Amino acid sequence: EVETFAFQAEIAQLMSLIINTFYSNKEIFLRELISNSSDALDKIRYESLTDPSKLDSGKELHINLIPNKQDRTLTIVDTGIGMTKADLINNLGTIAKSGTKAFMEALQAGADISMIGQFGVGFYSAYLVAEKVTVITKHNDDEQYAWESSAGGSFTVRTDTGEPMGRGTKVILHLKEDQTEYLEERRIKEIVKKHSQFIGYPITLFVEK
Ligand SMILES: Cc1ccc(C(N)=O)cc1N
C-alpha cells in the first residue's frame, strides 16, 4: 500500500534548481547528509540523558557509509532518532518551505549551492548526484517507513517490510550514471576528511568485493 504525495511547490522548485543548475562542486552532498545524521544522533543522545530506555532500540551511535557498485547506490546509515511517518511527509522533519525561501534569496544575492545546509534543506543536495533517493527510517514512536522520490514533483511513503532497522535512518542514493566516483573508496575517504573531520560520531566506510 503506497501513498503518493505532491511536494510543496517551493520544495519542487528547490529540487529542480538543484537538478538543473550547472554547479561542479557536487561532493558537498555527502557533508550535508553526514551532518543531518550527526544532528539526528545528537537528538537521541539528548533524549537518552533523562530516559535511558530511549536506547533500548540500540545503544550504538554511529554513521556508516556503504557503497555498492553492483546496485550503483551509496547508502548513509545512522542510528539517530529517526523520523515518524508525519516527519517524513513534513519534508523529512525540516522547515523546508521557509528554508527554501531563505536559500533562494541568498542565491540571487551571491550565495552558491554549497551553502544549502545553512538554510536547513541540505538533504535535497542528494539530488546533485542521485537520480532517486530512498529513505528508510525507524523512530521509537512509530513503525518503519520508506520514503522515495525521483523528483518530478512527487514522493511516496509506504510501510517498509524490508530489513528491520531498530532505530535510525538510511539514506539510499541511487547515483546518476556519471556520478559513480562517489562509490570509490579513495574518493569517499577524501570527501569525509575534507568536510566531515569534526563529526562527533564514528564514520565507518564499508569496503566491497
Ligand atoms: C532531512 C533529514 C533530517 C534528518 C535525517 C536523519 N538522518 O534522521 C534525514 C533527513 N533526510
Ligand 1, atom 7, residue with closest C-alpha: 37
CA distance 201 to 60: 10
Last residue before each gap in the chain (C to N over 2.5 A): none
Residue 15 in contact with residue 7, Cβ under 8 Å? Answer: yes
User: How many other β-carbons are positioned within 10 Å of the β-carbon of residue 84?
Assistant: 18
CA of 177 to the centre of ligand 1 (A): 25
CB within 8 A of 192, min separation 6: which ones?
30, 34, 65, 203, 205
Q: Which of 11, 169, 170, 203 to mutate to test the pocket of ligand 1 (most atoms within 8 A of CB)?
A: 169
CA distance 191 to 175: 16
Fold of 3-205: Heat Shock Protein 90 (3.30.565)
Domain ranges across the chain: 3-205
Residue 160 in contact with residue 50, Cβ under 8 Å? Answer: no
CB within 8 A of 8, min separation 6: which ones?
91, 96, 97
What residues are designated binding site?
A: 36, 78, 97, 123
For 77, the enclosing helix (H) or strand (E) is: strand 73-78
Closest ligand 1 atom number to CA of residue 94: 1
CA of 64 to the centre of ligand 1 (A): 14
- The Cα angle at residue 94 between residues 132 and 3, in degrees rounded to 5: 50
To one decimal, the resolution in angstroms is 1.7
CA of 63 to the centre of ligand 1 (A): 12
DSSP annotation of 10 reads H
